[PDB]
Design an enzyme around this catalytic site. Sequence first.
Site, PDB file in Angstrom:
ATOM      1  N   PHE A 209     -12.868  52.654  -4.622  1.00 15.21           N
ATOM      2  CA  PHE A 209     -14.489  52.354  -4.279  1.00 15.21           C
ATOM      3  C   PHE A 209     -14.546  52.557  -2.638  1.00 15.21           C
ATOM      4  CE2 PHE A 209     -18.575  49.894  -3.501  1.00 15.21           C
ATOM      5  CZ  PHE A 209     -19.377  50.535  -4.494  1.00 15.21           C
ATOM      6  N   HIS A 212     -18.391  50.494   2.288  1.00 10.61           N
ATOM      7  CA  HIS A 212     -19.791  50.119   2.222  1.00 10.61           C
ATOM      8  C   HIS A 212     -19.808  48.548   2.833  1.00 10.61           C
ATOM      9  CE1 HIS A 212     -17.395  47.866  -0.869  1.00 10.61           C
ATOM     10  NE2 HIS A 212     -18.440  47.053  -0.752  1.00 10.61           N
ATOM     11  N   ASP A 214     -21.806  44.996   2.055  1.00 10.36           N
ATOM     12  CA  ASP A 214     -22.342  44.537   0.864  1.00 10.36           C
ATOM     13  C   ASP A 214     -23.922  44.240   1.002  1.00 10.36           C
ATOM     14  OD1 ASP A 214     -19.913  44.133  -0.140  1.00 10.36           O
ATOM     15  OD2 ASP A 214     -19.591  42.010   0.101  1.00 10.36           O
ATOM     16  N   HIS A 268     -15.880  47.576   4.105  1.00  7.53           N
ATOM     17  CA  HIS A 268     -14.771  47.246   3.598  1.00  7.53           C
ATOM     18  C   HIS A 268     -14.767  48.295   2.264  1.00  7.53           C
ATOM     19  CE1 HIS A 268     -17.702  44.874   2.027  1.00  7.53           C
ATOM     20  NE2 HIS A 268     -17.111  44.784   0.600  1.00  7.53           N
TER      21      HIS A 268
HETATM   22  C1  LIG Z   1     -15.517  44.847  -3.288  1.00  7.28           C
HETATM   23  C2  LIG Z   1     -15.913  43.980  -4.400  1.00  7.28           C
HETATM   24  C3  LIG Z   1     -16.823  42.823  -4.470  1.00  7.28           C
HETATM   25  C4  LIG Z   1     -16.392  45.033  -5.667  1.00  7.28           C
HETATM   26  N1  LIG Z   1     -17.158  45.964  -5.311  1.00  7.28           N
HETATM   27  C5  LIG Z   1     -18.572  45.607  -5.663  1.00  7.28           C
HETATM   28  O1  LIG Z   1     -19.135  44.753  -6.223  1.00  7.28           O
HETATM   29  C6  LIG Z   1     -19.624  46.602  -5.074  1.00  7.28           C
HETATM   30  C7  LIG Z   1     -19.280  46.586  -3.589  1.00  7.28           C
HETATM   31  S1  LIG Z   1     -19.704  44.737  -2.882  1.00  7.28           S
HETATM   32  N2  LIG Z   1     -20.969  45.766  -5.527  1.00  7.28           N
HETATM   33  C8  LIG Z   1     -21.801  46.529  -6.286  1.00  7.28           C
HETATM   34  O2  LIG Z   1     -21.685  47.803  -6.752  1.00  7.28           O
HETATM   35  C9  LIG Z   1     -23.172  45.833  -6.368  1.00  7.28           C
HETATM   36  C10 LIG Z   1     -23.569  45.245  -7.850  1.00  7.28           C
HETATM   37  C11 LIG Z   1     -24.765  44.413  -7.669  1.00  7.28           C
HETATM   38  C12 LIG Z   1     -24.950  44.068  -9.058  1.00  7.28           C
HETATM   39  N3  LIG Z   1     -25.018  44.917 -10.068  1.00  7.28           N
HETATM   40  C13 LIG Z   1     -26.334  43.509  -8.973  1.00  7.28           C
HETATM   41  O3  LIG Z   1     -27.222  43.801  -9.597  1.00  7.28           O
HETATM   42  O4  LIG Z   1     -26.422  42.445  -8.004  1.00  7.28           O
HETATM   43  C14 LIG Z   1     -15.283  45.518  -6.373  1.00  7.28           C
HETATM   44  O5  LIG Z   1     -14.074  45.117  -6.834  1.00  7.28           O
HETATM   45  O6  LIG Z   1     -15.024  47.014  -6.487  1.00  7.28           O
HETATM   46 FE   LIG Z   2     -18.221  44.656  -1.230  1.00  4.17          FE
END
Ligand SMILES: CC(C)[C@@H](NC(=O)[C@H](CS)NC(=O)CCC[C@H](N)C(=O)O)C(=O)O
Ligand SMILES: [Fe+3]
Length: 329
Positions: A209, A212, A214, A268
Amino acid sequence: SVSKANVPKIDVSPLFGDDQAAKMRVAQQIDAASRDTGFFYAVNHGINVQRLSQKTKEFHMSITPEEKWDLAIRAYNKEHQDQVRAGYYLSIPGKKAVESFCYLNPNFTPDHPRIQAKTPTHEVNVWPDETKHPGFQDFAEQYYWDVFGLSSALLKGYALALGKEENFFARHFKPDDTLASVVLIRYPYLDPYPEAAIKTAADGTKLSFEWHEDVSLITVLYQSNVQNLQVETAAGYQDIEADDTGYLINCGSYMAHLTNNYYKAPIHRVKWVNAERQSLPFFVNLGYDSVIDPFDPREPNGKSDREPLSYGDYLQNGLVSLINKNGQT
Ligand SMILES: CC(C)[C@@H](NC(=O)[C@H](CS)NC(=O)CCC[C@H](N)C(=O)O)C(=O)O
Ligand SMILES: [Fe+3]
Protein backbone atom coordinates in the site's frame (compact mmCIF):
# COMPACT_ATOMS: atom_id res chain seq x y z
CA SER A 1 20.09 1.20 4.13
CA VAL A 2 16.81 1.67 6.05
CA SER A 3 16.77 3.07 9.56
CA LYS A 4 14.28 2.33 12.31
CA ALA A 5 11.78 4.87 13.57
CA ASN A 6 11.69 5.95 17.19
CA VAL A 7 8.27 4.73 18.30
CA PRO A 8 8.05 5.15 22.06
CA LYS A 9 5.95 2.90 24.26
CA ILE A 10 3.67 5.15 26.33
CA ASP A 11 1.84 3.76 29.34
CA VAL A 12 -1.57 5.35 28.76
CA SER A 13 -3.22 3.91 31.86
CA PRO A 14 -3.26 7.27 33.71
CA LEU A 15 -5.64 8.60 31.06
CA PHE A 16 -8.34 6.32 32.48
CA GLY A 17 -7.90 7.71 36.00
CA ASP A 18 -7.97 10.89 38.09
CA ASP A 19 -4.28 11.60 38.76
CA GLN A 20 -4.05 14.85 36.84
CA ALA A 21 -0.27 15.26 36.98
CA ALA A 22 0.21 11.67 35.85
CA LYS A 23 -2.07 12.46 32.91
CA MET A 24 0.06 15.50 32.10
CA ARG A 25 3.15 13.29 32.05
CA VAL A 26 1.41 11.02 29.53
CA ALA A 27 0.40 14.08 27.53
CA GLN A 28 4.00 15.24 27.36
CA GLN A 29 5.02 11.89 25.88
CA ILE A 30 2.23 12.11 23.31
CA ASP A 31 3.34 15.64 22.44
CA ALA A 32 6.93 14.53 21.98
CA ALA A 33 6.00 11.57 19.78
CA SER A 34 3.56 13.67 17.75
CA ARG A 35 6.27 16.27 17.07
CA ASP A 36 8.87 13.63 16.09
CA THR A 37 7.93 10.72 13.81
CA GLY A 38 4.25 10.94 14.70
CA PHE A 39 3.80 7.36 15.95
CA PHE A 40 3.80 5.80 19.39
CA TYR A 41 2.65 2.55 20.98
CA ALA A 42 -0.04 2.82 23.62
CA VAL A 43 0.67 0.20 26.28
CA ASN A 44 -1.37 -0.69 29.36
CA HIS A 45 -4.43 -0.03 27.19
CA GLY A 46 -6.77 -2.55 28.85
CA ILE A 47 -8.00 -4.30 25.66
CA ASN A 48 -7.77 -8.06 25.11
CA VAL A 49 -5.99 -7.87 21.78
CA GLN A 50 -5.35 -11.63 21.83
CA ARG A 51 -9.10 -12.29 21.70
CA LEU A 52 -9.38 -9.62 18.99
CA SER A 53 -6.78 -11.39 16.86
CA GLN A 54 -8.24 -14.84 17.46
CA LYS A 55 -11.84 -13.90 16.65
CA THR A 56 -10.75 -11.93 13.58
CA LYS A 57 -8.71 -14.89 12.32
CA GLU A 58 -11.66 -17.23 12.84
CA PHE A 59 -13.82 -14.91 10.72
CA HIS A 60 -11.29 -14.32 7.92
CA MET A 61 -10.48 -18.03 7.70
CA SER A 62 -14.08 -19.36 7.67
CA ILE A 63 -15.94 -16.95 5.32
CA THR A 64 -16.81 -18.41 1.89
CA PRO A 65 -16.90 -16.78 -1.57
CA GLU A 66 -20.69 -16.86 -1.44
CA GLU A 67 -20.74 -14.97 1.85
CA LYS A 68 -18.21 -12.46 0.51
CA TRP A 69 -20.42 -11.55 -2.47
CA ASP A 70 -23.40 -11.27 -0.13
CA LEU A 71 -21.54 -8.79 2.10
CA ALA A 72 -19.55 -7.03 -0.63
CA ILE A 73 -19.32 -3.26 -0.87
CA ARG A 74 -20.57 -1.67 -4.07
CA ALA A 75 -17.08 -1.61 -5.59
CA TYR A 76 -17.42 -5.40 -5.87
CA ASN A 77 -21.21 -5.84 -6.08
CA LYS A 78 -23.42 -3.44 -8.04
CA GLU A 79 -26.49 -4.69 -6.17
CA HIS A 80 -25.21 -3.02 -2.99
CA GLN A 81 -25.33 0.69 -3.85
CA ASP A 82 -25.78 1.72 -0.20
CA GLN A 83 -22.50 0.02 0.85
CA VAL A 84 -19.76 2.54 0.17
CA ARG A 85 -17.91 1.98 3.47
CA ALA A 86 -19.30 -1.01 5.37
CA GLY A 87 -18.95 -4.58 4.19
CA TYR A 88 -16.53 -6.97 2.56
CA TYR A 89 -13.65 -5.84 0.35
CA LEU A 90 -12.75 -8.85 -1.76
CA SER A 91 -9.36 -10.12 -2.77
CA ILE A 92 -8.81 -10.84 -6.45
CA PRO A 93 -6.59 -13.93 -6.77
CA GLY A 94 -3.66 -13.24 -9.04
CA LYS A 95 -4.15 -9.47 -8.78
CA LYS A 96 -5.06 -8.24 -5.29
CA ALA A 97 -3.95 -10.05 -2.16
CA VAL A 98 -5.54 -7.99 0.61
CA GLU A 99 -9.10 -8.43 1.72
CA SER A 100 -10.98 -6.83 4.54
CA PHE A 101 -14.26 -6.27 6.35
CA CYS A 102 -15.28 -2.78 7.48
CA TYR A 103 -17.96 -1.86 9.97
CA LEU A 104 -19.21 1.41 11.41
CA ASN A 105 -21.01 2.64 14.52
CA PRO A 106 -23.41 -0.15 15.62
CA ASN A 107 -25.87 2.61 16.57
CA PHE A 108 -26.48 3.36 12.87
CA THR A 109 -29.77 1.51 12.45
CA PRO A 110 -32.85 2.32 10.35
CA ASP A 111 -34.13 4.35 13.34
CA HIS A 112 -31.13 6.66 13.37
CA PRO A 113 -31.92 10.11 11.91
CA ARG A 114 -28.74 10.17 9.82
CA ILE A 115 -29.85 6.92 8.21
CA GLN A 116 -33.38 8.28 7.77
CA ALA A 117 -31.95 11.44 6.19
CA LYS A 118 -29.55 9.40 4.00
CA THR A 119 -26.61 11.56 5.05
CA PRO A 120 -23.39 10.57 3.23
CA THR A 121 -20.88 8.39 5.15
CA HIS A 122 -23.57 6.87 7.44
CA GLU A 123 -24.52 3.27 6.72
CA VAL A 124 -26.14 0.35 8.51
CA ASN A 125 -23.56 -2.40 9.05
CA VAL A 126 -23.92 -5.72 7.23
CA TRP A 127 -23.08 -8.98 8.96
CA PRO A 128 -22.66 -12.64 8.02
CA ASP A 129 -25.11 -15.30 9.11
CA GLU A 130 -24.84 -15.83 12.86
CA THR A 131 -25.00 -19.61 12.66
CA LYS A 132 -22.19 -19.78 10.10
CA HIS A 133 -20.21 -17.27 12.20
CA PRO A 134 -21.31 -17.76 15.80
CA GLY A 135 -20.34 -14.92 18.10
CA PHE A 136 -18.69 -12.86 15.37
CA GLN A 137 -21.09 -9.93 15.37
CA ASP A 138 -21.14 -9.86 19.18
CA PHE A 139 -17.35 -9.86 19.28
CA ALA A 140 -17.05 -7.16 16.63
CA GLU A 141 -19.59 -4.79 18.19
CA GLN A 142 -18.07 -5.30 21.65
CA TYR A 143 -14.66 -4.57 20.15
CA TYR A 144 -15.93 -1.33 18.59
CA TRP A 145 -16.92 -0.09 22.06
CA ASP A 146 -13.76 -1.40 23.73
CA VAL A 147 -11.55 0.52 21.26
CA PHE A 148 -13.91 3.51 21.42
CA GLY A 149 -13.19 3.66 25.14
CA LEU A 150 -9.42 3.47 24.66
CA SER A 151 -9.64 6.09 21.92
CA SER A 152 -11.61 8.49 24.12
CA ALA A 153 -8.87 8.26 26.74
CA LEU A 154 -6.17 8.82 24.10
CA LEU A 155 -8.05 11.91 22.90
CA LYS A 156 -7.83 13.28 26.45
CA GLY A 157 -4.07 12.80 26.23
CA TYR A 158 -3.91 14.64 22.91
CA ALA A 159 -6.01 17.53 24.23
CA LEU A 160 -3.79 17.95 27.30
CA ALA A 161 -0.69 17.66 25.09
CA LEU A 162 -1.90 20.66 23.06
CA GLY A 163 -2.57 22.79 26.14
CA LYS A 164 -6.33 22.24 26.10
CA GLU A 165 -8.82 20.93 28.62
CA GLU A 166 -9.04 17.15 28.45
CA ASN A 167 -12.44 17.02 26.71
CA PHE A 168 -11.45 19.29 23.82
CA PHE A 169 -11.56 16.44 21.29
CA ALA A 170 -13.47 13.79 23.23
CA ARG A 171 -16.56 15.98 23.58
CA HIS A 172 -17.03 15.50 19.80
CA PHE A 173 -16.46 11.72 19.96
CA LYS A 174 -19.79 10.24 20.98
CA PRO A 175 -21.45 6.82 20.66
CA ASP A 176 -24.63 8.24 19.14
CA ASP A 177 -22.98 9.83 16.10
CA THR A 178 -19.33 8.81 15.68
CA LEU A 179 -18.26 8.11 12.11
CA ALA A 180 -15.42 5.91 13.39
CA SER A 181 -14.80 2.62 11.62
CA VAL A 182 -13.13 -0.69 12.31
CA VAL A 183 -11.45 -2.53 9.45
CA LEU A 184 -10.49 -6.20 9.84
CA ILE A 185 -7.75 -6.62 7.24
CA ARG A 186 -6.19 -9.92 6.13
CA TYR A 187 -2.84 -9.81 4.37
CA PRO A 188 -2.29 -13.39 3.13
CA TYR A 189 0.69 -15.61 2.62
CA LEU A 190 0.76 -16.56 -1.07
CA ASP A 191 3.08 -18.95 -2.88
CA PRO A 192 3.65 -17.76 -5.59
CA TYR A 193 2.87 -14.20 -4.58
CA PRO A 194 1.59 -12.49 -7.73
CA GLU A 195 3.78 -9.57 -8.75
CA ALA A 196 0.60 -7.83 -9.88
CA ALA A 197 -0.32 -7.41 -6.21
CA ILE A 198 3.03 -5.71 -5.42
CA LYS A 199 3.68 -2.02 -6.02
CA THR A 200 7.12 -0.50 -6.53
CA ALA A 201 7.85 2.76 -4.72
CA ALA A 202 9.83 5.59 -6.28
CA ASP A 203 12.69 4.53 -3.98
CA GLY A 204 12.53 0.92 -5.21
CA THR A 205 10.81 -0.56 -2.15
CA LYS A 206 8.17 -3.22 -2.81
CA LEU A 207 4.88 -2.16 -1.24
CA SER A 208 1.42 -3.51 -0.54
CA PHE A 209 0.00 0.00 0.00
CA GLU A 210 1.48 3.32 -1.10
CA TRP A 211 2.27 6.41 0.91
CA HIS A 212 -0.65 8.27 2.42
CA GLU A 213 -1.85 10.38 5.30
CA ASP A 214 -4.69 8.90 7.29
CA VAL A 215 -8.23 10.16 6.94
CA SER A 216 -8.98 10.37 10.68
CA LEU A 217 -8.48 12.50 13.73
CA ILE A 218 -6.29 9.74 15.13
CA THR A 219 -5.80 6.11 14.13
CA VAL A 220 -5.67 3.32 16.72
CA LEU A 221 -4.17 0.21 15.18
CA TYR A 222 -3.63 -3.38 16.18
CA GLN A 223 -1.36 -5.44 13.98
CA SER A 224 -0.07 -8.96 14.33
CA ASN A 225 3.67 -9.56 14.76
CA VAL A 226 4.96 -8.98 11.25
CA GLN A 227 6.94 -5.81 10.58
CA ASN A 228 5.60 -3.89 7.59
CA LEU A 229 4.90 -0.18 8.26
CA GLN A 230 7.28 2.63 7.34
CA VAL A 231 7.02 6.32 8.24
CA GLU A 232 8.40 9.07 6.03
CA THR A 233 10.99 11.48 7.42
CA ALA A 234 13.07 14.09 5.64
CA ALA A 235 15.91 11.53 5.51
CA GLY A 236 13.62 8.91 3.97
CA TYR A 237 11.39 6.13 5.14
CA GLN A 238 12.01 4.45 8.49
CA ASP A 239 10.75 1.06 9.63
CA ILE A 240 8.15 0.92 12.42
CA GLU A 241 8.79 -2.12 14.57
CA ALA A 242 5.89 -4.44 15.24
CA ASP A 243 4.36 -5.02 18.68
CA ASP A 244 1.37 -7.37 18.84
CA THR A 245 0.68 -6.44 22.47
CA GLY A 246 0.14 -2.70 21.98
CA TYR A 247 -1.75 -0.23 19.85
CA LEU A 248 0.09 1.83 17.28
CA ILE A 249 -1.25 5.39 17.39
CA ASN A 250 -0.88 8.26 14.90
CA CYS A 251 -2.62 11.46 13.89
CA GLY A 252 -4.71 11.83 10.76
CA SER A 253 -5.09 14.82 8.53
CA TYR A 254 -7.98 16.32 10.51
CA MET A 255 -5.60 16.76 13.45
CA ALA A 256 -3.04 18.35 11.14
CA HIS A 257 -5.67 20.76 9.87
CA LEU A 258 -6.88 21.90 13.25
CA THR A 259 -3.38 22.28 14.74
CA ASN A 260 -2.05 24.26 11.74
CA ASN A 261 0.20 21.25 11.06
CA TYR A 262 1.80 21.36 14.52
CA TYR A 263 0.80 17.70 14.90
CA LYS A 264 1.35 16.50 11.37
CA ALA A 265 -0.42 13.54 9.88
CA PRO A 266 2.64 11.34 9.31
CA ILE A 267 3.02 9.96 5.84
CA HIS A 268 3.39 6.21 5.95
CA ARG A 269 3.23 3.14 3.73
CA VAL A 270 2.95 -0.65 3.93
CA LYS A 271 5.87 -2.79 2.76
CA TRP A 272 5.20 -5.97 0.86
CA VAL A 273 5.92 -8.94 3.12
CA ASN A 274 4.95 -12.46 2.10
CA ALA A 275 3.46 -13.51 5.43
CA GLU A 276 0.01 -14.19 6.83
CA ARG A 277 -0.90 -11.26 9.06
CA GLN A 278 -3.58 -8.88 10.34
CA SER A 279 -4.01 -5.09 10.23
CA LEU A 280 -6.94 -3.95 12.38
CA PRO A 281 -7.28 -0.16 12.39
CA PHE A 282 -9.85 1.85 14.26
CA PHE A 283 -10.20 5.23 12.55
CA VAL A 284 -11.22 7.78 15.16
CA ASN A 285 -13.72 10.01 13.36
CA LEU A 286 -16.02 12.60 14.92
CA GLY A 287 -19.68 13.29 14.10
CA TYR A 288 -20.84 14.51 10.72
CA ASP A 289 -21.42 18.08 11.91
CA SER A 290 -18.51 18.20 14.35
CA VAL A 291 -16.34 21.29 13.90
CA ILE A 292 -13.15 22.00 15.85
CA ASP A 293 -11.94 25.59 15.71
CA PRO A 294 -8.35 25.50 14.39
CA PHE A 295 -5.53 26.92 16.47
CA ASP A 296 -1.77 27.31 16.24
CA PRO A 297 0.11 26.16 19.38
CA ARG A 298 3.26 27.84 18.03
CA GLU A 299 1.85 31.34 18.28
CA PRO A 300 1.64 33.18 21.63
CA ASN A 301 -2.04 33.98 21.00
CA GLY A 302 -2.73 30.49 19.59
CA LYS A 303 -4.63 32.07 16.71
CA SER A 304 -5.03 30.32 13.36
CA ASP A 305 -6.55 31.71 10.16
CA ARG A 306 -7.55 28.22 8.97
CA GLU A 307 -11.22 27.64 8.32
CA PRO A 308 -13.22 25.39 10.63
CA LEU A 309 -13.75 22.19 8.64
CA SER A 310 -16.86 20.13 9.23
CA TYR A 311 -15.87 16.55 9.96
CA GLY A 312 -18.41 14.97 7.59
CA ASP A 313 -17.29 16.98 4.58
CA TYR A 314 -13.67 16.25 5.50
CA LEU A 315 -14.39 12.54 5.68
CA GLN A 316 -16.40 12.36 2.46
CA ASN A 317 -13.69 14.22 0.56
CA GLY A 318 -10.87 12.28 2.16
CA LEU A 319 -12.15 8.76 1.68
CA VAL A 320 -12.80 9.40 -2.01
CA SER A 321 -9.40 11.03 -2.51
CA LEU A 322 -7.59 8.15 -0.81
CA ILE A 323 -9.32 5.64 -3.11
CA ASN A 324 -8.37 7.72 -6.16
CA LYS A 325 -4.73 8.09 -5.08
CA ASN A 326 -4.00 4.65 -3.62
CA GLY A 327 -6.64 2.42 -5.23
CA GLN A 328 -9.82 0.65 -4.18
CA THR A 329 -8.86 -1.67 -1.29
C1 LIG B 1 -2.06 1.46 7.38
C2 LIG B 1 -3.14 0.53 7.92
C3 LIG B 1 -4.08 1.28 8.85
C4 LIG B 1 -3.91 -0.17 6.79
N1 LIG B 1 -4.35 0.76 5.77
C5 LIG B 1 -5.56 1.33 5.81
O1 LIG B 1 -6.43 0.99 6.62
C6 LIG B 1 -5.83 2.46 4.83
C7 LIG B 1 -4.76 3.52 5.03
S1 LIG B 1 -4.80 4.24 6.69
N2 LIG B 1 -7.14 3.04 5.11
C8 LIG B 1 -8.12 3.06 4.21
O2 LIG B 1 -8.03 2.52 3.11
C9 LIG B 1 -9.35 3.81 4.61
C10 LIG B 1 -10.48 2.87 5.01
C11 LIG B 1 -11.68 3.64 5.51
C12 LIG B 1 -12.86 2.77 5.84
N3 LIG B 1 -13.25 1.88 4.73
C13 LIG B 1 -13.99 3.69 6.20
O3 LIG B 1 -14.97 3.80 5.50
O4 LIG B 1 -13.78 4.36 7.31
C14 LIG B 1 -3.11 -1.32 6.21
O5 LIG B 1 -2.63 -2.17 6.93
O6 LIG B 1 -2.99 -1.29 4.90
FE1 LIG C 1 -2.67 4.66 7.26
